[PDB]
Amino acid sequence: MAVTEASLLRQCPLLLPQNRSKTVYEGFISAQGRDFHLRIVLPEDLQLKNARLLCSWQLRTILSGYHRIVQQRMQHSPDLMSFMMELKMLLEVALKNRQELYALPPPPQFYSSLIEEIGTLGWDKLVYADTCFSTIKLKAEDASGREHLITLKLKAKYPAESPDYFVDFPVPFCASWTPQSSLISIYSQFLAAIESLKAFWDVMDEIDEKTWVLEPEKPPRSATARRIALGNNVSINIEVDPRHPTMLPECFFLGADHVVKPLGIKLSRNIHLWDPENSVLQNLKDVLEIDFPARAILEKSDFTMDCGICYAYQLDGTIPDQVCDNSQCGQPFHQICLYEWLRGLLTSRQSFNIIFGECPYCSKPITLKM
Amino acid sequence: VPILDVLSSLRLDPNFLLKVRQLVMDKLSSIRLEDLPVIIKFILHSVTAMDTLEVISELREKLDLQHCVSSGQSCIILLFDVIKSAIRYEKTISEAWIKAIENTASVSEHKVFDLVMLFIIYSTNTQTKKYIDRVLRNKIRSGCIQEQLLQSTFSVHYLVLKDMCSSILSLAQSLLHSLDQSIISFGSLLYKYAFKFFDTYCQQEVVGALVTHICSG
Amino acid sequence: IDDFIGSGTEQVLLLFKDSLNSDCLTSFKITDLGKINYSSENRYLVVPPLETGLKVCFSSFRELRQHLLLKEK
Amino acid sequence: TLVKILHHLEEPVIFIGALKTEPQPDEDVHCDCLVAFGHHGRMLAIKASWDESGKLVPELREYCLPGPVLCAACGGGGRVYHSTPSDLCVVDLSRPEEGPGGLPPMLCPASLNICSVVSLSGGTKLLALSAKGRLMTCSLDESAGQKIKELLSGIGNISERVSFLKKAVDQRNKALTS
Numbered sequence: 162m163a164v165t166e167a168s169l170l171r172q173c174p175l176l177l178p179q180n181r182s183k184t185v186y187e188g189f190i191s192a193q194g195r196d197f198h199l200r201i202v203l204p205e206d207l208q209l210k211n212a213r214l215l216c217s218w219q220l221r222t223i224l225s226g227y228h229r230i231v232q233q234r235m236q237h238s239p240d241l242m243s244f245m246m247e248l249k250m251l252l253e254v255a256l257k258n259r260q261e262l263y264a265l266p267p268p269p270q271f272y273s274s275l276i277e278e279i280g281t282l283g284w285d286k287l288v289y290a291d292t293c294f295s296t297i298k299l300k301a302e303d304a305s306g307r308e309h310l311i312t313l314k315l316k317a318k319y320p321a322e323s324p325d326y327f328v329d330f331p332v333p334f335c336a337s338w339t340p341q342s343s344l345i346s347i348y349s350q351f352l353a354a355i356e357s358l359k360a361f362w363d364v365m366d367e368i369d370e371k372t373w374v375l376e377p378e379k380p381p382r383s384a385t386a387r388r389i390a391l392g393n394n395v396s397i398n399i400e401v402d403p404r405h406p407t408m409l410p411e412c413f414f415l416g417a418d419h420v421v422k423p424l425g426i427k428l429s430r431n432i433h434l435w436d437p438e439n440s441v442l443q444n445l446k447d448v449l450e451i452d453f454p455a456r457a458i459l460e461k462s463d464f465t466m467d468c469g470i471c472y473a474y475q476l477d478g479t480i481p482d483q484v485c486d487n488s489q490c491g492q493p494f495h496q497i498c499l500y501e502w503l504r505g506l507l508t509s510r511q512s513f514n515i516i517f518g519e520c521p522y523c524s525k526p527i528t529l530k531m
Numbered sequence: 532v533p534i535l536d537v538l539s540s541l542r543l544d545p546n547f548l549l550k551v552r553q554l555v556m557d558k559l560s561s562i563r564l565e566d567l568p569v570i571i572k573f574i575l576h577s578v579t580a581m582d583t584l585e586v587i588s589e590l591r592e593k594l595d596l597q598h599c600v601s602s603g604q605s606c607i608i609l610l611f612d613v614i615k616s617a618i619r620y621e622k623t624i625s626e627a628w629i630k631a632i633e634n635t636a637s638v639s640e641h642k643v644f645d646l647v648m649l650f651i652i653y654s655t656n657t658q659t660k661k662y663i664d665r666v667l668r669n670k671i672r673s674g675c676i677q678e679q680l681l682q683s684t685f686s687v688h689y690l691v692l693k694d695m696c697s698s699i700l701s702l703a704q705s706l707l708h709s710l711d712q713s714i715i716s717f718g719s720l721l722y723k724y725a726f727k728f729f730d731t732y733c734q735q736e737v738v739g740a741l742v743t744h745i746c747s748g
Numbered sequence: 749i750d751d752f753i754g755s756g757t758e759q760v761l762l763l764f765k766d767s768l769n770s771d772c773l774t775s776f777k778i779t780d781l782g783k784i785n786y787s788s789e790n791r792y793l794v795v796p797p798l799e800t801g802l803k804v805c806f807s808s809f810r811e812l813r814q815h816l817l818l819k820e821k
Numbered sequence: 822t823l824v825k826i827l828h829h830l831e832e833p834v835i836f837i838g839a840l841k842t843e844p845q846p847d848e849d850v851h852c853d854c855l856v857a858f859g860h861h862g863r864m865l866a867i868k869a870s871w872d873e874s875g876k877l878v879p880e881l882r883e884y885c886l887p888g889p890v891l892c893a894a895c896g897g898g899g900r901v902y903h904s905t906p907s908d909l910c911v912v913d914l915s916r917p918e919e920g921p922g923g924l925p926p927m928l929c930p931a932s933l934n935i936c937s938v939v940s941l942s943g944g945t946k947l948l949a950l951s952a953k954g955r956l957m958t959c960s961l962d963e964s965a966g967q968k969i970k971e972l973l974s975g976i977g978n979i980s981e982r983v984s985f986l987k988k989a990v991d992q993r994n995k996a997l998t999s
């Protein structure tokens with residue numbers, strides 16, 4: 162109400178007077194459905210510039226951080242009404258920040274139905290459950306038989322709300338959550354999301370097995386961009402559409418200005434021969450008109466594929482890609498080391514985003530595009 | 532936007548389109564960020580040989596670009612692109628636009644937009660370059676254009692300009708060859724910010740242009 | 749009965765029928781009745797979740813007893 | 822020739838100790854956190870946060886872990902070993918501090934008067950007394966058909982008392998407006 166013989170009830174129904182004079186109030190205060198003990202003793206007059214105020218030790222621990230704000234507001238407040246309103250707003254923000262302290266499940270809703278839904282899914286999809294029963298992980302199989310796991314976080318009462326779902330594959334997973342949706346509902350949704358990008362995996366596992374795959378080393382299911390070795394110290398990279406995987410992915414080469422040169426020239430005049438019905442590897446072998454070194458040496462150091470500046474492979478994951486346009490050197494280099502070297506050099510002239518200069522080993526013209 | 536596509540699709544009289552155009556121009560600060568560009572796209576499709584001046588005036592009056600705050604960047608960019616395409620694939624937009632900021636003479640309350648569009652137009656079709664120089668000298672001597680302007684201009688919208696830095700220098704070149712210290716100071720600030728925010732090649736071109744000024748000038 | 753294993757908890761020992769041999773300690777059987785059964789996986793995945801849940805809502809129960817007594821006073 | 826209460830827990834006290842939480846050899850390591858214990862399972866953790874004010878701030882916690890706690894002690898690496906009347910259980914803390922006070926057991930009976938020692942050899946080895954009066958030393962590093970029975974036994978234990986506490990809520994909302 163406007164008057165505090167009714168507004169005091171409407172806003173702190175739990176907070177009520179003991180003393181004849183309405184000077185000793187006691188009771189509780191509600192906050193997120195939690196009734197906290199409170200005793201509050203005003204002066205003879207209804208001035209808050211003095212207002213004795215003790216609590217629970219619970220409450221004083223929770224208000225460690227704001228007792229100065231209490232000292233401020235007790236003295237600055239016009240009325241006990243607005244004082245307590247602001248107090249409850251404060252309590253809510255306090256627990257909102259300290260929201261890590263909050264969970265308790267109802268068993269017969271939760272611990273009953275959840276194992277029925279597990280038997281619904283299959284106990285063999287069951288890969289893990291948490292000692293809290295907070296987390297649970299499950300398995301889905303691509304029709305090839307690739308395992309795609311997924312994690313799920315369960316509230317106190319699960320089907321009331323969405324569980325927090327965490328999945329490996331790259332596209333934003335959408336789970337249409339109704340309370341009628343159960344574990345198998347979201348499992349079918351998981352499968353439908355898997356079956357959309359199924360034929361992508363059918364090319365990806367092929368590429369994983371066949372060729373000298375380079376730099377999504379141990380590629381997860383998220384990986385839509387790949388890198389392949391070919392020839393020697395010339396590597397290609399690919400990025401594929403999960404929706405049209407056999408469609409031509411966008412690609413380019415890394416390597417030499419005499420090895421990468423006729424590779425693209427063949428590609429330009431055979432891309433029209435791209436038959437998307439075949440496998441991607443098979444299409445490439447004819448489009449590029451070559452065989453791969455199909456793991457032909459894979460990960461065995463003959464000192465060929467090495468920076469020559471830093472003398473390393475996978476410098477910050479960076480590959481020896483920049484090479485010499487020379488038959489005699491063919492010394493491959495990183496980006497960063499070659500950049501920093503041709504930085505200080507006097508002859509190193511800079512165009513838009515190019516650095517020219519001499520190869521460190523052979524002193525022949527070498528071009529770096531950033 | 533759907534409404535607009537549909538109105539492009541249906542059999543209509545144009546007098547109604549005009550009403551709607553005015554209507555959106557009122558309802559033009561009162562739009563969310565994202566669609567904005569396509570609305571403007573519509574407008575600039577919708578415009579004609581004659582109405583152009585007035586609509587632009589209203590537009591030039593209603594666009595702010597201090598108001599639009601990943602909080603405005605992508606969309607602004609896309610906007611500029613759109614405009615860029617518009618004034619690429621027709622000419623008279625630019626002459627009208629210039630006219631509009633040129634005859635905005637009494638206005639000592641000039642907004643950011645104007646310079647940005649000037650750069651752009653300088654970068655694009657070039658017959659008018661001498662027109663642009665002329666007008667820019669004239670507003671500078673008038674003192675309607677000043678330097679905290681350029682400050683906030685390069686403090687925000689630079690990203691637009693990176694890919695036309697060469698325009699800035701080709702201009703500053705013609706700025707320092709003139710008299711009237713304020714003009715020369717403007718060109719200075721140009722060279723300064725250009726070296727400041729942009730990349731190595733820019734910096735290099737800065738130094739290389741200043742040296743030329745020194746030795747020859 | 750004892751922790752003959754030395755794993756911490758008690759187990760049971762059983763002896764069968766000296767008809768076997770004129771010798772003790774043969775035909776034994778040790779067990780816990782849990783996983784432990786000595787003689788002469790989806791099921792084993794979900795127990796800790798349950799055993800948490802019981803004590804969890806037990807703590808809830810005690811908290812709300814305290815709550816009860818409080819407003820009574 | 823003064824004394825100062827700090828928090829006042831509300832159940833009988835059993836254990837007090839300290840930890841080097843975030844322990845990231847030397848005998849005396851600078852303890853970061855503080856721990857205090859009750860009898861009916863009320864635990865207290867204290868930390869210094871110096872956050873949210875640009876000044877030094879205390880960060881507190883009051884946990885309520887189950888069982889009438891019999892005894893406990895601190896393990897190196899920010900751990901605590903404590904004996905319920907059912908089993909011995911542990912709580913690790915080092916992460917600022919944990920929101921929930923989870924705990925596993927270690928498959929050992931209801932001990933009392935635990936006393937921990939550090940090896941730094943490998944791992945943690947300790948000492949204890951069984952409630953039956955037996956001393957022991959520790960070194961540290963069908964069924965689903967029974968499981969469903971266990972699930973539903975626990976559900977049946979809990980739902981009764983949830984309803985009971987709702988009956989309290991009704992009493993209380995009613996007496997309030999009285």
Ligand SMILES: [Zn+2]
Binds near residue numbers: 468471472476496
């Ligand atoms: Zn390197």
Ligand SMILES: [Zn+2]
Binds near residue numbers: 486491523
């Ligand atoms: Zn070379």
